[PDB]
Amino acid sequence: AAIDKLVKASHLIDMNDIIREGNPTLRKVAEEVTFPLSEKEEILGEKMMQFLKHSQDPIMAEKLGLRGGVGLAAPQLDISKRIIAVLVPNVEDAQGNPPKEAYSLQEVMYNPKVVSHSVQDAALSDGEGCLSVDREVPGYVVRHARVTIEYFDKTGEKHRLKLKGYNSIVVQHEIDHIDGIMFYDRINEKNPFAVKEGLLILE
Ligand SMILES: CCCCC[C@H](CC(=O)NO)C(=O)N[C@H](C(=O)N1CCC[C@H]1CO)C(C)C
Ligand SMILES: [Zn+2]
Ligand SMILES: [Zn+2]
Ligand SMILES: [Zn+2]
Ligand SMILES: [Zn+2]
Ligand SMILES: [Zn+2]
Ligand SMILES: [Zn+2]
Ligand SMILES: [Zn+2]
Ligand SMILES: [Zn+2]
What we know:
By secondary structure, the chain is an alpha+beta fold. The protein contains 4 helices and 8 strands. It has a single domain (1-203), classed as Peptide Deformylase, CATH 3.90.45. It has helices spanning 2-7, 39-56, 58-64, 165-178; strands spanning 71-73, 83-89, 103-117, 121-124, 143-144, 147-152, 158-163, 200-202. The structure holds actinonin and zinc ion (ZN) (8 copies). One zinc ion binds next to loops. One zinc ion binds next to helix 4. It is classed as hydrolase. The entry lists the keywords PDF, type 2, NME, N-terminal methionine excision, Streptococcus agalactiae, inhibitor, actinonin, hydrolase. It forms a monomeric assembly. Crystal structure of type 2 PDF from Streptococcus agalactiae in complex with actinonin.
């Protein structure tokens, strides 16, 4: 099955493992994982995080032909499970100094969900792109500004976490994938750049 291919020890996830727009798995509601995790589900989560790290690394991205990403959901690898990985980098300063924390968020999350959110909405000013979508899609992807999430880690431990900013946006995006929702679903149908008053536009 797809999972067996992906969890082979020597296998590195690349773009040929990522399904594309139009594949039905992208529109399913992903199934909840049960704890204790199987070996395969644990391995998949590790390989997903590995892909993001690769994707972000100039060398490996180039070796393996990867488009850079900051999150990945199991449904995008044809696996209908509630497993996402997020890897959101902090940026260097103007003098070239690395940030204090390499990442503002770095997590493999099992059964994640949004449990509360702000009334305020937000969108990234540059829009959103997707590894499964090979088309230009303009417009503001309107999300919750702030979210509280719950999720499990690979050991079964429950986390509850409030997010904001870019971190908020990224997790929302991944969560949507495990519910069958695509980013463009949240772009206004008649003017992609419409702004309802109070929308937090993020730079
Ligand atoms: C920001 C919402 C989360 C994006 C996650 C996606 C990758 C994906 O398809 N996840 O399921 C990505 O990294 N996309 C990038 C993306 O949209 N980025 C990366 C930097 C900020 C933002 C565009 O403004 C690229 C591929 C376009
Ligand atoms: Zn592969
Ligand atoms: Zn392990
Ligand atoms: Zn590596
Ligand atoms: Zn609500
Ligand atoms: Zn996506
Ligand atoms: Zn919501
Ligand atoms: Zn709760
Ligand atoms: Zn539309």
